[PDB]
Amino acid sequence: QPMIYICGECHTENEIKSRDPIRCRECGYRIMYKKRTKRLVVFDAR
Amino acid sequence: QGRFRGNLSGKRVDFSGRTVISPDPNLRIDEVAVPVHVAKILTFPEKVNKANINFLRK
Amino acid sequence: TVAVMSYSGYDIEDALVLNKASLDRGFGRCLVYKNAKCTLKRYTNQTFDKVMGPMLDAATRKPIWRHEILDADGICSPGEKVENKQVLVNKSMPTVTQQPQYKDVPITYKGATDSYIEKVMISSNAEDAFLIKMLLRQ
Amino acid sequence: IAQLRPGQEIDLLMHCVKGIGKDHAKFSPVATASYRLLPDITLLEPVEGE
Amino acid sequence: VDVVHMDENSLEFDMVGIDAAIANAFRRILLAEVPTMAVEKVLVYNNTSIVQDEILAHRLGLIPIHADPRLFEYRNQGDEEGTEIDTLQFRLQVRCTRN
Amino acid sequence: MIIPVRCFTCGKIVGNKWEAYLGLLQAEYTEGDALDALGLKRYCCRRMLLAHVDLIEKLLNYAPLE
Amino acid sequence: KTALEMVQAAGTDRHCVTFVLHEEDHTLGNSLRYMIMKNPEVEFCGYTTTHPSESKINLRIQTRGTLPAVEPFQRGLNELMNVCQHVLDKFEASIKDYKDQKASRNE
Amino acid sequence: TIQNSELMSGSMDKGTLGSGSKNNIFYILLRDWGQNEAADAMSRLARLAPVYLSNRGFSIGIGDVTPGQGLLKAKYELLNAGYKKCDEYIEALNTGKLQQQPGCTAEETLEALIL
Amino acid sequence: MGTKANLVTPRNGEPLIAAIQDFLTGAYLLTLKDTFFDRAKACQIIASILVGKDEKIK
Numbered sequence: 081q082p083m084i085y086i087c088g089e090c091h092t093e094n095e096i097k098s099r100d101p102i103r104c105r106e107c108g109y110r111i112m113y114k115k116r117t118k119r120l121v122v123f124d125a126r
Numbered sequence: 127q128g129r130f131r132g133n134l135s136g137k138r139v140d141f142s143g144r145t146v147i148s149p150d151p152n153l154r155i156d157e158v159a160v161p162v163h164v165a166k167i168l169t170f171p172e173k174v175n176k177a178n179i180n181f182l183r184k
Numbered sequence: 185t186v187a188v189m190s191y192s193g194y195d196i197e198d199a200l201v202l203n204k205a206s207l208d209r210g211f212g213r214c215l216v217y218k219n220a221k222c223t224l225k226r227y228t229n230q231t232f233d234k235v236m237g238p239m240l241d242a243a244t245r246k247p248i249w250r251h252e253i254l255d256a257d258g259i260c261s262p263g264e265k266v267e268n269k270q271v272l273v274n275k276s277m278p279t280v281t282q283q284p285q286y287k288d289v290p291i292t293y294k295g296a297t298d299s300y301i302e303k304v305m306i307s308s309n310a311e312d313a314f315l316i317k318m319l320l321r322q
Numbered sequence: 323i324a325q326l327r328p329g330q331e332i333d334l335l336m337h338c339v340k341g342i343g344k345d346h347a348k349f350s351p352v353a354t355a356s357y358r359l360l361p362d363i364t365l366l367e368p369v370e371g372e
Numbered sequence: 373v374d375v376v377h378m379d380e381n382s383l384e385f386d387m388v389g390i391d392a393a394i395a396n397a398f399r400r401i402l403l404a405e406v407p408t409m410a411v412e413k414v415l416v417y418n419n420t421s422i423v424q425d426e427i428l429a430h431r432l433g434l435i436p437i438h439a440d441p442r443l444f445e446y447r448n449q450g451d452e453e454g455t456e457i458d459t460l461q462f463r464l465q466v467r468c469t470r471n
Numbered sequence: 472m473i474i475p476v477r478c479f480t481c482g483k484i485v486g487n488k489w490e491a492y493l494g495l496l497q498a499e500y501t502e503g504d505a506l507d508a509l510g511l512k513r514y515c516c517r518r519m520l521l522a523h524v525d526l527i528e529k530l531l532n533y534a535p536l537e
Numbered sequence: 538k539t540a541l542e543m544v545q546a547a548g549t550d551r552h553c554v555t556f557v558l559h560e561e562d563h564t565l566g567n568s569l570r571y572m573i574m575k576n577p578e579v580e581f582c583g584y585t586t587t588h589p590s591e592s593k594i595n596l597r598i599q600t601r602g603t604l605p606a607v608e609p610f611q612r613g614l615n616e617l618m619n620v621c622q623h624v625l626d627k628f629e630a631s632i633k634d635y636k637d638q639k640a641s642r643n644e
Numbered sequence: 645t646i647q648n649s650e651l652m653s654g655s656m657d658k659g660t661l662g663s664g665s666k667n668n669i670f671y672i673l674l675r676d677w678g679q680n681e682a683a684d685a686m687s688r689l690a691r692l693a694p695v696y697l698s699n700r701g702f703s704i705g706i707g708d709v710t711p712g713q714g715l716l717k718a719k720y721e722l723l724n725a726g727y728k729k730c731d732e733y734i735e736a737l738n739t740g741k742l743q744q745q746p747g748c749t750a751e752e753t754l755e756a757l758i759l
Numbered sequence: 760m761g762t763k764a765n766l767v768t769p770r771n772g773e774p775l776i777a778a779i780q781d782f783l784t785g786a787y788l789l790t791l792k793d794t795f796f797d798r799a800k801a802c803q804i805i806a807s808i809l810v811g812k813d814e815k816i817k
């Protein structure tokens with residue numbers, strides 16, 4: 081129900097909800113990647 | 127890129143395509159094999175008359 | 185494994201004949217990564233660009249087809265596939281040229297074929313602008 | 323199949339079907355199958371000495 | 373027909389009197405028309421490795437499956453679910469942790 | 472990246488021979504004897520192990536991890 | 538849905554006919570040509586893939602006398618089928634004999 | 645020699661099928677029997693000749709450009725003879741009389757003899 | 760501007776649309792004095808042309 085971002089360097093969940101400048105909670109590293117989606121995808125094995 | 131050299135002498139045209147070529151001897155010498163993903167885009171306006179109404183309905 | 189022979193006449197001027205089974209087992213398989221970036225700048229007025237969520241269909245409680253791949257924060261998600269004319273970052277800007285009015289300027293995926301979003305990077309500069317980079321894959 | 327590091331996870335679901343080798347090379351049952359004609363090296367004149 | 377050698381996963385046998393245009397047919401049927409079972413649909417939940425999803429599905433396609441394919445039928449056009457008769461199903465689930 | 476499952480040319484399953492190939496190159500075989508002892512007669516199978524670079528052992532040092 | 542279509546020649550009544558075989562390739566074409574050319578009433582027999590994108594062969598059969606070319610085509614199919622039956626029987630007998638001889642030795 | 649569209653002798657070079665010049669058999673078919681027969685003949689040849697060639701087999705290897713013994717003797721003799729005559733021409737220019745060719749200096753005569 | 764109506768170049772009157780590599784070598788190795796065919800392989804080579812508009816001929 082919230083959005084959860086993975087930190088770039090230290091691999092922690094950060095949960096950026098407030099309108100903040102982007103910042104890791106534990107480190108000072110300033111790059112976030114989204115998590116992988118929960119829905120399923122179908123690939124052909126070709 | 128002025129009017130004369132840019133637009134009067136040689137001007138860009140539509141109803142055209144551009145693809146990499148590859149050989150195929152099984153065609154006659156007066157045939158070219160157009161891909162499907164180009165022939166769905168390039169169109170020819172065929173006026174409806176008595177000879178081809180049943181073709182153009184399909 | 186290259187044979188040097190003349191085969192079937194489809195190899196006339198420098199052309200070369202491949203093997204279908206070699207192509208199926210993995211020969212020459214290649215990945216293409218592209219980029220799609222969007223910036224969310226803060227203006228001289230105290231007004232900011234914003235990312236709306238997925239505009240749902242109220243009739244079926246599913247998002248519309250042009251917004252199908254979005255997450256709940258308007259930014260597309262890793263793992264899902266994109267087709268032609270879908271949105272990736274649902275940007276909206278102020279038309280200040282009293283309340284701010286927003287027009288939609290989404291960042292759509294122009295492309296011939298389907299892609300896979302691999303990672304979505306979200307970071308900022310010091311000027312409060314947000315940089316969002318996707319990494320597409322075919 | 324793949325190779326991992328801690329934190330990474332694979333959780334997928336595969337559907338095997340029946341297929342012939344003409345369609346795709348993953349259905350072919352043989353590693354390779356060939357044939358060669360059985361030779362007969364024959365001698366014209368007798369080979370003696372070194 | 374004289375079988376000169378045989379073990380697991382291999383065979384070697386002589387044929388006398390057949391012609392090239394029939395022995396070539398036996399070779400081509402062995403390469404391209406004897407059906408087997410192989411993965412086609414890879415339904416992915418949470419792939420977070422470095423091996424990309426496309427390449428992983430392609431590697432899973434090439435793995436031989438020991439089903440005896442005289443017992444199964446061809447899946448029809450479409451029919452993404454499948455039934456008891458015309459499919460198998462394999463489930464892979466690996467999570468990596470520190471020792 | 473990682474070893475291919477099947478040889479590109481013939482079709483023999485080569486993707487299980489890799490961990491045995493490095494194990495036989497820890498015990499100081501030559502490559503010419505190791506590829507024979509693994510049982511790759513055709514040279515199309517032999518180039519799958521003789522020419523393969525194992526990038527994923529060195530790409531996994533750069534993956535993010537807890 | 539029909540996989541066999543018979544295109545006759547322009548001026549000749551049924552003794553020079555071209556068999557279009559859908560959903561085949563060189564596999565059946567070469568073996569069937571081999572079993573047709575053994576029939577001594579066939580003057581000409583040979584196939585061709587129309588285009589490699591398509592799975593067709595055109596198997597032209599031209600007979601000598603007055604018999605129509607459907608009969609050498611049918612005799613070629615039946616003779617190829619009986620060859621495959623005999624090969625299957627002899628091969629299964631040889632496999633059973635090999636397994637029996639190996640399981641009888643070193644016991 | 646083609647007579648009544650039956651090849652009676654001789655093989656088809658470039659000079660009989662290729663795009664070089666006249667006496668092309670397709671040019672004969674163009675001038676005597678219309679465009680349609682020339683185009684049908686070119687289509688039939690382009691259809692037929694690979695079907696023969698890909699079942700003949702036609703290949704080139706390092707054994708096809710390797711030199712035999714009869715070349716490796718003659719090349720050594722030719723290089724020794726040519727380098728001797730070049731050395732005698734160099735010596736005839738620098739420290740003696742060199743027979744000057746008409747219309748040029750002596751060094752251009754040396755260049756012409758060495759070439 | 761058809762292919763069949765422009766078989767000869769306007770420069771000197773020599774043809775341009777003609778055979779090229781692997782069609783010359785095929786016809787040269789077909790028309791040596793050495794080659795001979797049985798009835799099977801001769802029928803197999805001749806039958807490659809029976810396609811297209813030459814499908815109806817004897």
Ligand SMILES: [Zn+2]
Pocket residue numbers: 087088089090091092104105106107108109
């Ligand atoms: Zn951090």
Ligand SMILES: [Zn+2]
Pocket residue numbers: 478479480481482483513514515516517
């Ligand atoms: Zn191999």
